[PDB]
Amino acid sequence: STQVRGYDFNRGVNYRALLEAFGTTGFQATNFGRAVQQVNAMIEKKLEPLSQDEDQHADLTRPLTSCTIFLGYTSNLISSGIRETIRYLVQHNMVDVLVTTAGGVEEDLIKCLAPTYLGEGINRIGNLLVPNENYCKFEDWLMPILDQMVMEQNTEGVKWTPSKMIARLGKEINNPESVYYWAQKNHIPVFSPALTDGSLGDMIFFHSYKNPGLVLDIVEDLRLINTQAIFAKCTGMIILGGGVVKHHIANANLMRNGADYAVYINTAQEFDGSIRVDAQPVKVYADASLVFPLLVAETFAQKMDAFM
Amino acid sequence: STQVRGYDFNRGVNYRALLEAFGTTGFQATNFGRAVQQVNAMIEKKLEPLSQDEDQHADLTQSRRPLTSCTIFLGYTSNLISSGIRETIRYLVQHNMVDVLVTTAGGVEEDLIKCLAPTYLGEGINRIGNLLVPNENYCKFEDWLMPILDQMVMEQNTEGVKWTPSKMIARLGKEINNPESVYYWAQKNHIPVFSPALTDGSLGDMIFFHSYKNPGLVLDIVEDLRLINTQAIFAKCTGMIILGGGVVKHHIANANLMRNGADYAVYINTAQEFDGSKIRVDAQPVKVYADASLVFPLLVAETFAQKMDAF
Amino acid sequence: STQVRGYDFNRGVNYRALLEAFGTTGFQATNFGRAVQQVNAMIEKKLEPLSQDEDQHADLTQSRRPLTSCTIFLGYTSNLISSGIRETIRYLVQHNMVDVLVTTAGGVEEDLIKCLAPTYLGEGINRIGNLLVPNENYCKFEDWLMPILDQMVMEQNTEGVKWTPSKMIARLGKEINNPESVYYWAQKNHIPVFSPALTDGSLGDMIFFHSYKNPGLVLDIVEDLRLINTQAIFAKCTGMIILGGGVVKHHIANANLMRNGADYAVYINTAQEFDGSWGKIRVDAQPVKVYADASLVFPLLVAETFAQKMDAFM
Amino acid sequence: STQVRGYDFNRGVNYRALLEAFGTTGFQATNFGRAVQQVNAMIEKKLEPLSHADLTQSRRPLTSCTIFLGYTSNLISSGIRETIRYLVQHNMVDVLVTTAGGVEEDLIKCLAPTYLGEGINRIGNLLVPNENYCKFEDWLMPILDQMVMEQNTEGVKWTPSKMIARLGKEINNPESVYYWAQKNHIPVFSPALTDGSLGDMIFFHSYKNPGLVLDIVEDLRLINTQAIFAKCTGMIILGGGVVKHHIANANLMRNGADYAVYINTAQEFDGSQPVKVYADASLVFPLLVAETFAQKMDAF
Numbered sequence A: 001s002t003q004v005r006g007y008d009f010n011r012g013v014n015y016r017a018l019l020e021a022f023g024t025t026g027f028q029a030t031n032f033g034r035a036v037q038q039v040n041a042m043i044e045k046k047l048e049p050l051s052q053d054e055d056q057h058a059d060l061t062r063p064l065t066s067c068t069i070f071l072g073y074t075s076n077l078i079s080s081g082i083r084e085t086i087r088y089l090v091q092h093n094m095v096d097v098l099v100t101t102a103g104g105v106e107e108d109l110i111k112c113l114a115p116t117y118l119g120e121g122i123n124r125i126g127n128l129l130v131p132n133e134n135y136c137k138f139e140d141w142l143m144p145i146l147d148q149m150v151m152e153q154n155t156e157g158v159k160w161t162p163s164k165m166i167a168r169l170g171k172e173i174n175n176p177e178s179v180y181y182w183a184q185k186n187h188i189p190v191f192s193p194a195l196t197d198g199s200l201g202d203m204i205f206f207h208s209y210k211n212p213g214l215v216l217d218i219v220e221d222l223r224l225i226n227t228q229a230i231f232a233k234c235t236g237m238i239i240l241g242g243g244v245v246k247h248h249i250a251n252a253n254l255m256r257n258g259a260d261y262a263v264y265i266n267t268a269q270e271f272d273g274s275i276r277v278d279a280q281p282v283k284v285y286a287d288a289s290l291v292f293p294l295l296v297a298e299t300f301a302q303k304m305d306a307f308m
Numbered sequence B: 001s002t003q004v005r006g007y008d009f010n011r012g013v014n015y016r017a018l019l020e021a022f023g024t025t026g027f028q029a030t031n032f033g034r035a036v037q038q039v040n041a042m043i044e045k046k047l048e049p050l051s052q053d054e055d056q057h058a059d060l061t062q063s064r065r066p067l068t069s070c071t072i073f074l075g076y077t078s079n080l081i082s083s084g085i086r087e088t089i090r091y092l093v094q095h096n097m098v099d100v101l102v103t104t105a106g107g108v109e110e111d112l113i114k115c116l117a118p119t120y121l122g123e124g125i126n127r128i129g130n131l132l133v134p135n136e137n138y139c140k141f142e143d144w145l146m147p148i149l150d151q152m153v154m155e156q157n158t159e160g161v162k163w164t165p166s167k168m169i170a171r172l173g174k175e176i177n178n179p180e181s182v183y184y185w186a187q188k189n190h191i192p193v194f195s196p197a198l199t200d201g202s203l204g205d206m207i208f209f210h211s212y213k214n215p216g217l218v219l220d221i222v223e224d225l226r227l228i229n230t231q232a233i234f235a236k237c238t239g240m241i242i243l244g245g246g247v248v249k250h251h252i253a254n255a256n257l258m259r260n261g262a263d264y265a266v267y268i269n270t271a272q273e274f275d276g277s278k279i280r281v282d283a284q285p286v287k288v289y290a291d292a293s294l295v296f297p298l299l300v301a302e303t304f305a306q307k308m309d310a311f
Numbered sequence C: 001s002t003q004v005r006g007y008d009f010n011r012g013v014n015y016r017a018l019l020e021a022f023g024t025t026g027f028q029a030t031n032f033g034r035a036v037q038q039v040n041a042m043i044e045k046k047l048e049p050l051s052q053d054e055d056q057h058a059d060l061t062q063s064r065r066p067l068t069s070c071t072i073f074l075g076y077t078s079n080l081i082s083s084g085i086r087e088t089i090r091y092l093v094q095h096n097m098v099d100v101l102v103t104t105a106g107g108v109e110e111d112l113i114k115c116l117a118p119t120y121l122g123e124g125i126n127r128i129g130n131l132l133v134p135n136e137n138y139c140k141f142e143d144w145l146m147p148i149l150d151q152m153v154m155e156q157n158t159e160g161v162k163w164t165p166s167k168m169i170a171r172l173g174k175e176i177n178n179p180e181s182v183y184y185w186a187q188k189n190h191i192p193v194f195s196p197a198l199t200d201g202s203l204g205d206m207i208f209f210h211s212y213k214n215p216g217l218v219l220d221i222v223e224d225l226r227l228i229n230t231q232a233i234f235a236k237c238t239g240m241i242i243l244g245g246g247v248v249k250h251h252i253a254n255a256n257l258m259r260n261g262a263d264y265a266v267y268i269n270t271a272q273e274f275d276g277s278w279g280k281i282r283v284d285a286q287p288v289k290v291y292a293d294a295s296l297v298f299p300l301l302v303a304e305t306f307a308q309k310m311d312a313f314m
Numbered sequence D: 001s002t003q004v005r006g007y008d009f010n011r012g013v014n015y016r017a018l019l020e021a022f023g024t025t026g027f028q029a030t031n032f033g034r035a036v037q038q039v040n041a042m043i044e045k046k047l048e049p050l051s052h053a054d055l056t057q058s059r060r061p062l063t064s065c066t067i068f069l070g071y072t073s074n075l076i077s078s079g080i081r082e083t084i085r086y087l088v089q090h091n092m093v094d095v096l097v098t099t100a101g102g103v104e105e106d107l108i109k110c111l112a113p114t115y116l117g118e119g120i121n122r123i124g125n126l127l128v129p130n131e132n133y134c135k136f137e138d139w140l141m142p143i144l145d146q147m148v149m150e151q152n153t154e155g156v157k158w159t160p161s162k163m164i165a166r167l168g169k170e171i172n173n174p175e176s177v178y179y180w181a182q183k184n185h186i187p188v189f190s191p192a193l194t195d196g197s198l199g200d201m202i203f204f205h206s207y208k209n210p211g212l213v214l215d216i217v218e219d220l221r222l223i224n225t226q227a228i229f230a231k232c233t234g235m236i237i238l239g240g241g242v243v244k245h246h247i248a249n250a251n252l253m254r255n256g257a258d259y260a261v262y263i264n265t266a267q268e269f270d271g272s273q274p275v276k277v278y279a280d281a282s283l284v285f286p287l288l289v290a291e292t293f294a295q296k297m298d299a300f
């Protein structure tokens, strides 16, 4: 059994030892240390070379690795500075699939046009402020792209889905601060059935009266996200801010393995009800704005050289 | 200014007086009393007669549902459909007391599955909090669903049907043909159901599996985007009752869309604010910080169920 | 196995059937139904006829309260006394439906102050969640309190009184002499009130100020430690109803003290577990926890339990 | 206005820059950055040279900022016990306040360890073997005998703070928070001292050796004189509302806190300017100390 012991500041400030001491500190500090262990296990799996046999399985679809990592996050984390943390992972191909919620696409693209501010015509998101002007700049940028998307649908047989639209918006924003710029550049698909539930939806709706008939099919994206999970050698999940992806994915009939590694960081409670098996997930009960940068510092950022 | 005073049990037990006394009890009891007041205000607005030969904008809404003086949006998380709140929601939909439903992944199939086999109390099983759904329930559902999915794909070819989540949910409600089903009553009463996340759970696993046996099903979210927005834009007045989480974010006022803010908005959930989880403005919402499994039946008893005669 | 089924409003509004249907609704509704079952079992145990040597228990407990077949401890946070749940608690104490009260800093003075001036709904003021207590209410209480503290110090110094929080709370309840007061009824019915944190808030500010005018008041917690323990040790059976937080931690079973675990334990609060917040001794029964604001749940619980057995307490 | 921007890991892992970037990250990360600013302001005030003992009835010399450190007992069961012990060891705080269990869980750890989980006492994901309490009871009983004798023969008027100082002196172990508090004349307040296991043992002891008195009114005067004679007041309150923020009282000559940080996961909705970080203090408090007190070790 491991004894409870906190970091001793009589040693001075050794940041690596202080962060490792979370594991023996207890409560959510211990969950954080278990999350670091799970994510380091994911990364070490991902960096294992595929055999010529495994490599063959992999190509039945970006290059397959030994661990396909799904990174799911709520839109609020894109409004926060965690946008930079996510952009870094996507930029360096450290994760394979993104899943987000309503607002999670446009809040990244808008930040390329105008900043979000700290608080305590304004959109308030917790202690953040997005001036209404930011949405106006975004709408002016978006409308011509929606025109091209409808023309391509009608003249070049394009069958749009949320993931194909998000790839197109990332290509158009053409800005290395953008999560979605890097995802499309690095062939990391982005899934968001809720893509139209917020401001981007208001704009697509408005656009549809002057230029009707845009179709966004969710069933083709249903097949694409499943293909990422079914053809994976191994599956990891890092899910932030809420239940963006429920942990139970193991499905014998679909040939879909459970995740070998799963980390959840959120402040949701269980009490109101909010093939390889599904591994026991690690849950850190904490604001991901605090915890996710610390997790990335102790895991992905330690293996930067291997992803360059 | 209103004095804090709880119900006096020396009066014995008058449930109406006990429930009204929540308003002066404080903390979330007071919020419950304010939620009762807001929903009763919504209902009284809805029951106001609408102006003579009123422009329906049936051509603008593409809906067969007649306009009332207050369009009520009822949003709820799937977990509430697994709970007994399924019965509470089914009652409101059955009596045309709400106009639009919005739900999350699982919120459709957990209602339909309960028509085939029961969900059980806990403490091959799917655990949802203290509830248990036997895996066999999903097997029965899949056997029932596959032939309907076949008909839906063929109707794209034979009838020019352009499926959306709302149109699929109405079809599944018609097929289940069971008056215990929320979705049976919604399609019978022309109450549309919106759920872009329709395919994110077990129903999605089945649609995915079916799509290799019978390819072609398209579910378009943009036509549903237009349908849900036109319900809010052509509303004379808007009410929102949102349960279990942020199924719908409160700020809907949009001058460019001529979309009024809600005049009345009630939220019942246990989510925290601290981690960030011309047109009429968005009225200040009432939030009751509580499990909707406790609060929603009490809310309905003191509001909709009091005005059953008018519906 | 019990099927999940909510109340069907097609039956109309039958409040008793609606409240019973919480049991089959799931999530915290089911926990509420379990809490009603546990409290009804506590009350039915309490109402079972006893035989016992009255003088004998009295000399061991140093209490005038007669033993029943179940000793019920009611614990609550001070915020619930600021709320309308003050009326709910006062009712239970008035009718001798509970045996012992335990509260936290503020839980005594917020009841006494309401006898002098009202607390108001919000959304010089003390804000307690969405409640407002005007600062003037505390000034009226201070004016009322100072002469009583003078008498308490005189009785200590001339009549050998050894003050404890429970003895002080009984004296304040006697002095307020107002049937709206929880503490008026507790002292009238010989229900002791325990609060080691009695002086951590406004009442403490006033005791502190008074000690400059009239020094040497002693409030001993060790004699109260013995009084609360003897209530639990000489209990035939123990129930706990704990509101608003962990006012009393549920594990009380102690072989060395001959202190039985609770046979029935109900907790109503919104606290989380995640941040760490010989067949002769009865075990600690598994508690029922309802994750809910007690301001909503406690009156419903009382309606379906204690209020149904009012006849047996007359 | 400050722009929202997270730490860019393209810059590599620079821990000081990463921790500062919490300030511009938003949500509770921003609150953490504000908490570091408030505590650094407290420390800078405390280290200002000053231009009392008969008024406070304390041997502790006044500084330019009196810091009250309040914490729930669960944090003493956690590894935050080490973080608290460090601050007390180096006289970086002036007054401790805790809740039921917060004294004995420090002393018991000097006799036997607490273990990680997921005859055992469970405290969240921590395990305290029942034998730990048995070793503590064996150690405690002789001290209680001496305390009652000193009361009855040497006129000692015990209070929770005087008992906690005595237990810290007796444990005589530099891993103990309460050892360092009594060594450094840092008083510890706990009216709830007897609500838990230590109370069970004092109660048991009272049968064979009756009449121990623990007075709370003398402690009421001692904690107030710490606040009244303060030039400036800082509060660091962990795990819950151990001390409510509003202390300003004109009639008592008691100033409000100039600086206040609260770290806990309590919600305001059921009725349970300071900086509040809504977070488990087991995660946040070591980071806060690393960027504040530990940076100024030389000055202490």
Ligand SMILES: CC(C)C[C@H](CN)n1ccc2c(-c3cccnc3)cccc2c1=O
Pocket (backbone or CB within 6 Å): A099, A191, A192, A193, A218, A219, A221, A222, A225, A226, A229, A244, A245, A246, A249, B199, B200, B201, B202, B204, B205
């Ligand atoms: C993780 C997935 C491979 C499996 C899992 C099965 N429950 N699953 C599927 C889709 C899925 C989607 C989705 C659906 C359709 C189109 N675009 C995205 C979105 C969010 C979560 C999931 C999700 O959790």
Ligand SMILES: CC(C)C[C@H](CN)n1ccc2c(-c3cccnc3)cccc2c1=O
Pocket (backbone or CB within 6 Å): A196, A197, A198, A199, A201, A202, B073, B102, B194, B195, B196, B221, B222, B224, B225, B228, B229, B232, B247, B248, B249, B251, B252
């Ligand atoms: C409530 C709505 C009238 C406006 C509001 C604007 N933020 N809005 C829009 C769509 C919407 C949708 C949606 C989108 C597309 C297809 N089916 C459903 C789903 C959930 C929430 C919203 C939602 O909150």
Ligand SMILES: CC(C)C[C@H](CN)n1ccc2c(-c3cccnc3)cccc2c1=O
Pocket (backbone or CB within 6 Å): C102, C194, C195, C196, C221, C222, C224, C225, C228, C229, C232, C247, C248, C249, C251, C252, D194, D195, D196, D197, D199, D200
């Ligand atoms: C409930 C009790 C019989 C036993 C239990 C043992 N853990 N216990 C004891 C005292 C106790 C007290 C107390 C202490 C001293 C004076 N006045 C009140 C206060 C709050 C909780 C408890 C409490 O939880």
Ligand SMILES: CC(C)C[C@H](CN)n1ccc2c(-c3cccnc3)cccc2c1=O
Pocket (backbone or CB within 6 Å): C199, C200, C201, C202, C204, C205, D097, D189, D190, D191, D216, D217, D219, D220, D223, D224, D227, D242, D243, D244, D247
């Ligand atoms: C911080 C204090 C100077 C003033 C403040 C006024 N509300 N105050 C007082 C006592 C106090 C005590 C206390 C009381 C008596 C004996 N031992 C400790 C415990 C906890 C918090 C407080 C507390 O918050």
